[PDB]
Amino acid sequence: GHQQLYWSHPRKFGQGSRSCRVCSNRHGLIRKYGLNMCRQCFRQYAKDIGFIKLD
Amino acid sequence: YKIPDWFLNRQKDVKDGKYSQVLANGLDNKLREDLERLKKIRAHRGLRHFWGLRVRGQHTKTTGRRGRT
Amino acid sequence: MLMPKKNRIAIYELLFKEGVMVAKKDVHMPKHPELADKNVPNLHVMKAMQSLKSRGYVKEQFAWRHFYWYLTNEGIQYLRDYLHLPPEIVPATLRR
Amino acid sequence: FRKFTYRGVDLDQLLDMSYEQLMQLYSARQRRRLSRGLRRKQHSLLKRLRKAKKEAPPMEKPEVVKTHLRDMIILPEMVGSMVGVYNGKTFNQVEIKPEMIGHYLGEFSITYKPVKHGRP
Amino acid sequence: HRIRITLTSRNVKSLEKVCADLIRGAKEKNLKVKGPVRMPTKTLRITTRKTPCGEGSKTWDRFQMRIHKRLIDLHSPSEIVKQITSISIEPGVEVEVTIA
Amino acid sequence: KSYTTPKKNKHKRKKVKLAVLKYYKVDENGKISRLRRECPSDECGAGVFMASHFDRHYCGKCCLTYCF
Amino acid sequence: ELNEFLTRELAEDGYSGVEVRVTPTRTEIIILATRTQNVLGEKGRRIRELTAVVQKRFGFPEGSVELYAEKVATRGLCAIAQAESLRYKLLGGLAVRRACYGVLRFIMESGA
RNA sequence: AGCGUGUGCCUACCCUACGCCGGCAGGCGCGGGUAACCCGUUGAACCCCAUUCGUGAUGGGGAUCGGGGAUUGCAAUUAUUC
RNA sequence: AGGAGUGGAGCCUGCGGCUUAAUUUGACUCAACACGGGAAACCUCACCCGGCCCGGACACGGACAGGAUUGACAGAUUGAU
Ligand SMILES: [Zn+2]
């Protein structure tokens, strides 16, 4: 069955369980504190969330 | 004389399953029959010991320069 | 795409009761979050709304991972003829 | 000609004992594969290939059943057979010796050909 | 009577202003009030690259948040806490009220 | 387009005409006589039949094979 | 997500910024735009549509929120609104230079 | 000693005190923490004190490699790791 | 003026070259070479040997509820019930 073979790889762990919430690319994720974002979109919305530059 | 079995260097031999602490001529004989066993069994490890390349899965492009001339 | 009758029409009164609905854009979604009483996936919902888009009844907007589908007045008329209702029932979008 | 054995016992002696003591005779890595739940999740292929190896011809060389799997636990129940496993391009036909056990069929089929070198 | 009121925000000036409002109301109602206990703040340090590609000098950023918390323990019944929570509401600082 | 490797065609189901002739036998009396064994599963109805093989029958979307 | 969603939606309305507030059972959001007659749609239709969208997409109890609408003063003192106005002037198709000195004159007469 | 970190929308991978088993990594229960509350007074390494070693490719250096035992995972062979 | 060094030894990583069904690609003095947040066993994958699903919407014209097709079981079959 194609319906039962469509889910044959378990997506429990690895890189494919998580993805970017903006650009949907599984490269350079930030799993810190539940961003689940890539670095570039985090840069684009860093000050909108509230991350500023002081140090 | 009450030495623990796990301390011995060779455990669970393929010919008898008996734990035995082996010595110089014994290690040389066991190494050469193991090499001959891998050559006769024709495995990936046997081909690597025949070719002299890496066995434990490591790179050769950068390190291991002094393999041959 | 061959849809069962019940799932498609259930999408139709969910669109008719409240004139706007959202859905996450992902192929591998075995169950819709809001409509979880019956086993309905999401890809049939996206394909049915894409068909409605191409025949010109709904609009599209996409921000991160969620599709936003916006009905029109002539879309409300199409829902009224497809659900076979008298022209007196108006959804809460036009109501105060 | 000499007597072959694995851990001091014979092939038929391995044949008439169950998996619960077969793992006790095996090594540490082979135990955790066989003792991890039920062989139904991904090892339904393993069970069906073991059924297919239990299917037998009359008295000749047994059939070749070429496979697409490399993580085969080489059991004594399939000693003396013919199989060619997949390594990406073709099927390397190998005859199953009694010393195959304790290894994998993917270990006995090389993927890369022997690399030769010439003028840079 | 053992109610603990926790005030937390990011901007310390608005939190100090609403703490001044709380202590002014407590002194107006003429009852004992605990001073605002100041915990050490928690920092949000994330260091990401500046080049989106792999070209150029390796330069980084320093993004940071400061969250300041000041809790007031009040020896009053619940309805005064509910009234003072209902008055003077701003989105900069949130109010955490939970009896033990 | 035409590639090097051959391709097996999809299962083009051949159209069979007058299938409603081949479900019940009609005689002079008005009582019908079914020619196929009925599926007793609750997923399908009482009007469905079983497949006509040469050894044993076969149900519909239930996909249940009953022996003798 | 709310700011990007309103930026994408009200690009053809002149949207400046969203004023989110938190309040017990009165969690209200204010959308500051230069146009008031176009944000409400037709007899308060699009504001209720956006209310329902955020209501059952963000995850909230139903009926406890309301979407306000107001106009921003000093239209020439907002960088987003003037960039959107120049995007209005450029989307129809004009010379870039006349629009550039026009929006510069608008900025200078606004008091910047 | 000090920066920190510690139970997730999709989601299932959190930090460990305490008492047994075992040289060892590790195995089952009794718990705490949505956090200056519990790990935690984070008994860190370097360093200090006392024997053994004695200029020797040597208790320096630990590459290469054989056997055995455990955890993660559907799967470790082209040694994942210990 | 000096301190620690690198370059020589072993190991890890990257690049070029050779090789490969494929060993995917960009970056070549500062201002590319533990860089692409690139510590990849499977997804990652963009590379290859191979096989199924359509995820070809919507219109125009052929076929209609008497059927336009998907869903499958003793057995040859890749690779898999
Ligand atoms: Zn049936």
UniProtKB/Swiss-Prot annotation, chain B:
Compartment(s) where it occurs, according to its Swiss-Prot or TrEMBL record: Cytoplasm
Chain positions with N6-acetyllysine modification: 18, 30
Residues annotated as signal peptide: none
Covalent cross-link Glycyl lysine isopeptide (Lys-Gly) (interchain with G-Cter in SUMO2) as placed by the record, residue numbers: 15, 18, 30
Superkingdom of origin: Eukaryota
Family indicated by similarity: Belongs to the universal ribosomal protein uS13 family.
Known partners and oligomeric status: Component of the small ribosomal subunit.
Biological role: Component of the small ribosomal subunit. The ribosome is a large ribonucleoprotein complex responsible for the synthesis of proteins in the cell.
Entry protein name: Small ribosomal subunit protein uS13
Organism the protein comes from: Oryctolagus cuniculus (Rabbit)
Lineage start: Eukaryota, Metazoa, Chordata, Craniata, Vertebrata
Gene this chain is encoded by: RPS18
From Swiss-Prot, chain D:
GO molecular function, one term: MDM2/MDM4 family protein binding
Keywords: Acetylation, Cytoplasm, Isopeptide bond, Ribonucleoprotein, Ribosomal protein, Ubl conjugation
Cross-link (Glycyl lysine isopeptide (Lys-Gly) (interchain with G-Cter in SUMO2)): 97
GO BP annotations listed: positive regulation of signal transduction by p53 class mediator; ribosomal small subunit assembly; ribosomal small subunit export from nucleus; rRNA processing; translation
Domain of life: Eukaryota
Protein's UniProt keywords contain Signal: no
Subcellular location: Cytoplasm
Keyword Ubl conjugation part of the UniProt annotation: yes
Major subcellular site: cytoplasm
Cellular component, GO, one term: cytosolic ribosome
Family: Belongs to the universal ribosomal protein uS19 family.
Function comment: Component of the small ribosomal subunit. The ribosome is a large ribonucleoprotein complex responsible for the synthesis of proteins in the cell.
Binding partners and assembly: Component of the small ribosomal subunit.
Protein's recorded name: Small ribosomal subunit protein uS19
Source organism of the structure: Oryctolagus cuniculus (Rabbit)
Highest classification ranks of the organism: Eukaryota, Metazoa, Chordata, Craniata, Vertebrata
Part of the full-length chain shown: 12 to 131 of 145
UniProtKB/Swiss-Prot annotation, chain E:
PTM text: Polyubiquitinated by ZNF598 via 'Lys-63'-linked ubiquitin chains when a ribosome has stalled, initiating the ribosome quality control (RQC) pathway to degrade the potentially detrimental aberrant nascent polypeptide. Deubiquitinated by OTUD3 and USP21, antagonizing ZNF598 activity. Ufmylated by UFL1.
Gene Ontology terms for molecular function: RNA binding; structural constituent of ribosome
Localization in the cell: Cytoplasm
Keyword Protein biosynthesis assigned: no
Keywords attached to this entry: Acetylation, Cytoplasm, Isopeptide bond, Phosphoprotein, Ribonucleoprotein, Ribosomal protein, Ubl conjugation
Main location: cytoplasm
GO BP term (any one): translation
The keyword Amino-acid biosynthesis belongs to this UniProt entry's keyword annotation: no
Location of Phosphoserine modifications: 76
N6-acetyllysine modification, residue list: 17, 58
Similarity comment: Belongs to the universal ribosomal protein uS10 family.
Known role: Component of the small ribosomal subunit. The ribosome is a large ribonucleoprotein complex responsible for the synthesis of proteins in the cell.
Subunit-structure text: Component of the 40S small ribosomal subunit.
Name of this chain's protein: Small ribosomal subunit protein uS10
Source species of the chain: Oryctolagus cuniculus
Name of encoding gene: RPS20
Shown stretch of the complete protein: 18 to 117 of 119
From Swiss-Prot, chain G:
Residues found modified as Asymmetric dimethylarginine: 45-46, 48
Gene name of the record: RPS3
UniProt subcellular location: Cytoplasm; Nucleus; Nucleus, Nucleolus; Mitochondrion inner membrane
UniProt protein name: Small ribosomal subunit protein uS3
Subunit relationships: Component of the 40S small ribosomal subunit. Identified in a IGF2BP1-dependent mRNP granule complex containing untranslated mRNAs. Interacts with HNRPD. Interacts with PRMT1; the interaction methylates RPS3. Interacts with SUMO1; the interaction sumoylates RPS3. Interacts with UBC9. Interacts with CDK1; the interaction phosphorylates RPS3. Interacts with PRKCD; the interaction phosphorylates RPS3. Interacts with PKB/AKT; the interaction phosphorylates RPS3.
The family this protein is said to belong to: Belongs to the universal ribosomal protein uS3 family.
Shown residues within the full chain: 20 to 131 of 243
Annotated TM spans: none
Lineage start: Eukaryota, Metazoa, Chordata, Craniata, Vertebrata
Domain KH type-2: 2-73
Modified residues (Phosphothreonine): 23, 51
Originating organism: Oryctolagus cuniculus (Rabbit)
Residues bearing the modification N6-acetyllysine: 43
Residue positions, PTM Phosphoserine: 16, 85
Cross-link Glycyl lysine isopeptide (Lys-Gly) (interchain with G-Cter in ubiquitin) mapped to chain: 71
Mod. after translation: Methylation by PRMT1 is required for import into the nucleolus and for ribosome assembly.
